[PDB]
Design a protein around this ligand. Structure first.
Ligand SMILES: Cc1nc(Nc2ncc(C(=O)Nc3c(C)cccc3Cl)s2)cc(N2CCN(CCO)CC2)n1
Length: 256
């Protein structure tokens, strides 16, 4: 055992958040935590990745209970996943400046993943968590190592070529989720149709009210050639600086 191990006694599970299986609770009596119950060695591989990763915009591993029944413990993100946040009562007041900020924060987390030579493989709004003051943090490292086809770059879906560049593809798809309040990508298209179309050069259009400059950023993330796509470093700086350098005369609309 390493120094991330704790006694199971120290964990008070309370409110069930999700199943499939995450709980809200307390650790050592004072600490609000999230706890993920459950091959049990493939379940521990997630915590393995999470021990190596530490960044303000990645959900923080606190502790493991490496003996069955097993638990992974992290910081608690008060507002649940981005997907549900976007589609629920909060979503309707989110405008472009809040949404590009959330995206900058996600980009920043992924820039860290990029610097560390990791790949996420499951980057999407269902795998981002929201806290207080609209903090967004990259979650779910089950497929991370040193797939829903609608978010997955073609080379990775077909041939198994997952790289930081296919995460960049996924990020472009996540930007459509932000700007549509979390609608499923490629409306009215099934998986197979998405495959066929994307291969014939099809890309989703500019969502209503989304500046063309942001849609152009999506299209760059969606370059057929993985090496043509921008880095997260570029994405983070572009999105941080957006309302000064790229759309200085942005005007608020009904939806964005
Ligand atoms: C599904 C969900 N998670 C929430 N917070 C979480 N923080 C961290 C989470 C997590 O899974 N950590 C983790 C673990 C433990 C292991 C490996 C990897 C990881 Cl990343 S889950 C809050 C939440 N709420 C329900 C809806 N409510 C509606 C608001 O009105 C808000 C509150 N629901």
């Amino acid at each position: 055992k390493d120094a991330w191990e704790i006694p199971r006694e120290s964990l008070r599970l309370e409110v069930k958040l999700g199943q499939g299986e995450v709980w809200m609770g307390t650790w050592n009596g004072t600490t609000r935590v999230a706890i993920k119950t459950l091959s049990p060695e493939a379940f521990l591989q997630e915590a393995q990745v999470m021990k190596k990763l530490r960044h303000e915009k990645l959900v923080q591993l606190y502790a493991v209970v490496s003996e069955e029944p097993i638990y992974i413990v992290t910081e608690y993100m008060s507002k649940g996943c981005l997907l549900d946040f976007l589609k629920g009562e909060m979503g309707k007041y989110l405008r472009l400046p809040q949404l590009v900020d959330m995206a900058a924060q996600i980009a920043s987390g992924m820039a860290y993943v990029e610097r560390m030579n990791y790949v996420h493989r499951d980057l999407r709004a269902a795998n981002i968590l929201v806290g207080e003051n609209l903090v967004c943090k990259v979650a779910d490292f089950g497929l991370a190592r040193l797939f829903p086809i609608k978010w997955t770059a073609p080379e990775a879906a077909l041939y198994g070529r997952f790289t930081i560049k296919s995460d960049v593809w996924s990020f472009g798809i996540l930007l459509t989720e932000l700007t549509t309040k979390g609608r499923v990508p490629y409306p009215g298209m099934v998986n197979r149709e998405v495959l066929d179309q994307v291969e014939r050069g099809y890309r989703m259009p500019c969502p209503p009210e989304c500046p063309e400059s942001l849609h152009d950023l999506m299209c760059q993330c969606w370059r057929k050639d993985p090496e043509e796509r921008p880095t997260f470093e570029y994405l983070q700086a572009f999105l941080e600086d957006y309302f000064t350098s790229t759309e200085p005369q942005y005007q608020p609309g009904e939806n964005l």
